[PDB]
Design a binder for this molecule. Structure first.
Ligand code: HEM
Ligand code: HEM
Lengths: 727, 727
């Protein structure tokens, strides 16, 4: 109809722009030049739209897409309207089953590149040449909730990477915590059923705060390690860009000589580690249930590409038994103070998808998708995972040919004797559909193992024992890793952990379940146990108070790599600041604030009590991003209030509340000139306090103080001060 | 094995208990004695568990459900472990596609009963006899969000009722608003795509506040009437028990003599009409995203059974064209001032399901599922709905035998010649699978239509016109029902409407879309348009200021039944009060509180700053239901603060914040004795204020005041005092 506005304002600029600045859009419309080989091979299935006639699926042009065919304009719909019928039919079949676990996820395209050849330890082609680029597709996710639940729940996050190598798809399907809850895959369905919504009423969504989770945990102490991690701030990351990633299981690297090495896979966030605080995370599920999805997407459109360093913990075959814990036990971490992570390569995520359904929702990852140069181990959880995935994927995607869906295909077409199945797209021409054959001179052919481009051979690990359904006795230790984790956290991290356990156990209706969790916490650490106990109105028995603590892990009293914050790794590029305007902002302060933010790659959003524009003292017209209520403090990393007619907003409940919520959630607050009248709102002494930047104006110094606070992410020293303000 | 606790406290009592008193459970365990013919017929597929051996699906007992089968305790898992493969396999295939629309739903069982015989106007058997009951199954839902999305979003609600009649299943598939957004089923996929998450990034969930939605609305003014309903407090109901239900389309009633009467179906909630306020509802999507689901379930476990009265708007065939709107247009409502709702029967929901998946998720409703005595009309939206539902259910549920899933089966066996299909449960013995046949003497047989127990015969409506894809010109009016809706709302409802539009349009990135919506509102009502425009920083043009308002609807200047609150209809039974404990509560006050609350059937939740128990002044041990933060004021209808050691909670940040949030949300607050000191927290004058009950102690008058206030639902007169309080 030519409904677009005459001005071109409906379509974003195909260049990197700041979050909130332009309508977001499909990846290849937004960043047409961001390319790689996999992204280039997808061009054959991308479809355009502009300037085409509207058609049926069979190519017939549609004249009237507003009406059904009927006998009279007020008469009955006629069965012969095939156009109406195809439209409703497709719509009626849009949905597919969501993943059993990790149904909520957000994904992006990018590339990986190794720093140096790793040929001495692995013949994996993607690790052999630093001038070589392997396209990747990453999907991050939550675990428990549906595809439509909230992003910022407390939970473990999945972190799956598909590597389209030259010798096959390698999928590195890991999580954001280095261990899992259970030891043997046989218990996956019991554990997952316990954390998922309870069967009689399907409640609660996206939460482990319910009886069944804690019943299970209280009966299966192998779970306490990963439960500590989830109860901590690790359970509620600030963003997918600011969390670690782990393969979890011990795998094998295999070189050209046949030497096998043990490896654990790590991803280090180049943006540093950072998480929200519980009240903030919970509230954020209400105000913006898509916060992680949006943030990841907008980060990529702004050019703040999520960057991660692939790292390896390497353990020679001869040191297999040299630890306190079993290397093949997935509830056990390998302390970096014992086995350091070696830097291997870098992954950059620089393009969003075009169609979430087509690329994200249909993407299929599998930990069994390994390439020559890698191999498994006998880890019993990994071993049972090797059976799931493909199984579930055919159910979910419609057939065994789901490897032909565009996102899932290798960069080089495969050749084998597999035929038919639902929705077969390739048309095979080989005369032979079996091997060995003589009618196609045996093609395609087997390829011996070799140093490069050889066929897949499993490592000839020795196998010895009886056929038994038995847990290895070396896996029977459950409290020493949870304790190592506990001792490595800072004091404010310990309290957050205490509050995580306290909050969750309080949603457990059956009191005895709470008491049993407390009993288990008393086997990890007495100080942890007493503080949780106290929050539940429980007193430990004398016996509980004398439980002897678990042994150290290989003599360690702590390991600082396990804390999010003990060792500062801050980075503010990509963070965002809220700027509370008034109806006559001193433009001098605004100019100084925005330019300083911009120099460090920090984003800003101009907020007011209404939408539209406000005009600064010199006549500068300032466009408003969102209102105070519309873009709450939960969504920003810090707040700045410029001088101006402060009386315009000083009595605005939403304005004041904005600073109270941000102060409560430990965020840096900066007040310029008369904005300092808000100090009374958050009870700040005349003197001032650490975490509150204030001055007569927003000069250079003022912005450097604010940015330094931003580099340390939150104002932990404010904790005792927040207790009292009602917010 | 002894896992249950000694006391037997792991399992709920099988009697009506207030919310949070005991753990919730499967309805047949919770209320074994609640029966009806449908509930009893589910007995063939209901399964027990206590005292049974754990077995495979093939009946083989399992000895070890903790371990996979491997070669040596630390070796690899063996392919021959069929116990493990079955377990993992069934889990891998758990999920089914969720509903295309209305995926988020909460359901229950109950019964319906007519007040009197309706045999002069219909031959439908379920309306023929006041002493004959019909089992029902009801599913309430949101529209936009997925199965794991939140309950208290802003959206339309679906209200589907499955009547298991003696002459077949009748499904009355309605919503909580009398009209739908569009006129022709052809546009359904267009309208649902625009409101659903945006295709590139799949954001946002369960919210219409995004560009594609408002883009569609601004170009399709036929959507404005249901947009008005959605933006008012109808869009955020307090409970599924506190909303209206409507079939929306005009349908037909056909009596035994063949006379047709046009009819619109209504449900009246006997718990009255009530809704949340936006800030509360959005915040509630974070604190408790399963709030409506939970409240329904717990109301039924408490004995507070959701009850609705079925009502009919009856219009004789000769009055088809007597309104100034088309009777067959589903964007138009029939004002109760023109055609009254006649009482027809009562529906009571008295039993929760046993398994949400098996009975809620697999339930299938179809507006095409009518019985003799009822028939359709040419409503173009209704007509195209008959091309859908069956279709989607076969892909969703797995095949054409979805009528054989327990929850969907009619009470009496069905008989026909249809055979085979995936998962066929019935085993047919008819020698003939076709008709006419002579080998089974033509059984089963066709039955002629008649007054009772006859075959279905469509009403013989005259059809006249050419085959056209054309909108009836009589449907071409879009502004007068919107305006009639607007003028019938109270002043505080109109402010709420203004704010919904202001809020939503502010999340619309492209400003011209905001401007187009405003221009459409200026065709409905200038005052409304002006208020929205001013919140968006927009100026109405001179042209926009001179648009003549649309015509009245058949001389009406308003219709009070369109308002939630203009006519008082308050019912407190089943509501819930928060009681903020301290560590030395005046048992005298608590006693008075609970006895008065009990007499009106209002529940209570005892809150404290920690979990466990507190002891009152007389030694009564009071167990704590939840903390102040853990069960926020959002979740209750009113707040009571009893005397006791007030100093224990006087400086409690969460306790003070509880009252500020409640106050802001217009909830009734009661303060006894020293609890009156919290009056400063919410800045209330020394004298007093309408909406705050205060006294030396909690007494007879104290509770009456409080209960009278709760019967009015919210304190609307407090609206002007809340926007300064930063809450
Ligand atoms: C170390 C332990 C595990 C980790 C790190 C892990 C990680 C993941 C991740 C990240 C995903 C989502 C991938 C995506 O975004 O599509 C996922 C999905 C899945 N996981 Fe695993 N998981 C683990 C254990 C298991 C086990 C023991 C089983 C069962 C034997 C299992 C079965 C599944 C299934 C069936 C899916 C759905 C896949 C699909 O539909 O494509 N997981 N897992
Ligand atoms: C008056 C307008 C409409 C109303 C009141 C309405 C109501 C409903 C309700 C309440 C449900 C959920 C049923 C449940 O709880 O299982 C539903 C589902 C559905 N609706 Fe309608 N709807 C309307 C228009 C339409 C139209 C025009 C179409 C397509 C032509 C349509 C297609 C569907 C489909 C495909 C489902 C999913 C059913 C299933 O998977 O079992 N609806 N509708």
């Amino acid at each position: 109809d030519s409904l677009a506005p005459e001005d071109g304002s409906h379509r974003p600029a195909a260049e990197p722009t700041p979050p909130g600045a332009q309508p977001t859009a499909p990846g290849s419309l937004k960043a047409p030049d961001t390319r790689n080989e996999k992204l280039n091979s997808l061009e054959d299935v991308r479809k355009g739209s502009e300037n085409y006639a509207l058609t049926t699926n069979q190519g017939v042009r549609i004249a009237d897409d507003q009406n059904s065919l009927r006998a009279g304009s007020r008469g009955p719909t006629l069965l012969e309207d095939f156009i109406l019928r195809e439209k409703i039919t497709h719509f009626d079949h849009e949905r597919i089953p969501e993943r059993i676990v990790n149904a909520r996820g957000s994904a992006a395209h990018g590339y990986f590149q190794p720093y140096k050849s790793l040929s001495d330890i692995t013949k994996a082609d993607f690790l052999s040449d630093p001038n070589k680029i392997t396209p990747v597709f990453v999907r991050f996710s939550t675990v428990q909730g549906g595809a439509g639940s909230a992003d910022t729940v407390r939970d473990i996050r999945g972190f799956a990477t598909k590597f389209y190598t030259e010798e096959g798809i390698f999928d590195l399907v890991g999580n954001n915590t280095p261990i899992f809850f259970i030891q043997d895959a046989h218990k996956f369905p019991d554990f997952v059923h316990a954390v998922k919504p309870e069967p009689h009423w399907a409640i609660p969504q996206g939460q482990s705060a319910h009886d069944t989770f804690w019943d299970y945990v209280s009966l299966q102490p192998e779970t306490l390690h990963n439960v500590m991690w989830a109860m901590s701030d690790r359970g509620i990351p600030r963003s997918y860009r600011t969390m670690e990633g782990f393969g979890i299981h011990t795998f094998r690297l295999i070189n050209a000589e046949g030497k096998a090495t043990f490896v654990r896979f790590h991803w280090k966030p180049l943006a540093g580690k950072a998480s929200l605080v519980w009240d903030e995370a919970q509230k954020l599920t209400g105000r913006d249930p898509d916060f992680h999805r949006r943030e990841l997407w907008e980060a990529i459109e702004a050019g703040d590409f999520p960057e991660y360093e692939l790292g390896f913990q390497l353990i020679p075959e001869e040191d297999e038994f040299k630890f306190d814990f079993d290397l093949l036990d997935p509830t056990k971490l390998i302390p970096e103070e014992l086995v350091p992570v070696q830097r291997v390569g870098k992954m950059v995520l620089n393009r969003n998808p075009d169609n979430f359904f087509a690329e994200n929702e249909q993407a299929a990852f599998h930990p069994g998708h390994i390439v020559p140069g890698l191999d498994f181990t006998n880890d019993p959880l990994l071993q049972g995972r090797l059976f799931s995935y493909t199984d579930t994927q055919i159910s979910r995607l419609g057939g065994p040919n789901f490897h032909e869906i565009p996102i899932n295909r290798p960069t080089c077409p495969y050749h084998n004797f597999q035929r038919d199945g639902m929705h077969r797209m390739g048309i095979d021409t080989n005369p032979a559909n079996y091997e060995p054959n003589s009618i196609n001179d045996n093609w395609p052919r087997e390829t011996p193992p070799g140093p490069k481009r050889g066929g897949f051979e499993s490592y000839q690990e020795r196998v010895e024992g009886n056929k038994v359904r038995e847990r290895s006795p070396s896996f029977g230790e459950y409290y020493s890793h949870p304790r190592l984790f506990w001792l490595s956290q800072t004091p404010f991290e310990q309290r957050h952990i205490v509050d995580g356990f306290s909050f969750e156990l309080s949603k457990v209706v059956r009191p005895y379940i709470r008491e049993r969790v407390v009993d288990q916490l008393a086997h990890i650490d007495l100080t942890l146990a007493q503080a949780v106990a106290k929050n539940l109105g429980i007193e430990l028995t004398d016996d509980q108070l004398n439980i002897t603590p678990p042994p150290d892990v290989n003599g360690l009293k702590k390991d600082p790599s396990l804390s999010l914050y003990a060792i500062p790794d801050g980075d503010v590029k990509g963070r965002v600041v809220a700027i509370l305007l008034n109806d006559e902002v001193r433009s001098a302060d605004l100019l100084a604030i925005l330019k300083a933010l911009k120099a460090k790659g920090v984003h800003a959003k101009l907020l007011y009590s209404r939408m539209g524009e406000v005009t600064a003292d010199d006549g500068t017209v300032l466009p408003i991003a969102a209102t105070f209520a519309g873009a709450p403090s939960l969504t920003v990393d810090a707040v700045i209030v410029p001088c101006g007619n402060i009386a315009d907003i000083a009595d605005n409940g939403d304005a004041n509340y904005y600073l109270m919520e941000a102060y409560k959630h430990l965020k840096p607050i900066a007040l310029a000139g008369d904005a300092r009248k808000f100090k009374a709102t958050i009870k700040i002494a005349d003197q001032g306090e650490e975490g509150i930047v204030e001055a007569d104006s927003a000069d250079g110094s003022f912005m450097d103080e604010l940015l330094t606070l931003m580099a340390a992410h939150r104002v932990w020293s404010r904790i005792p001060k927040i207790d009292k303000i009602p917010a």
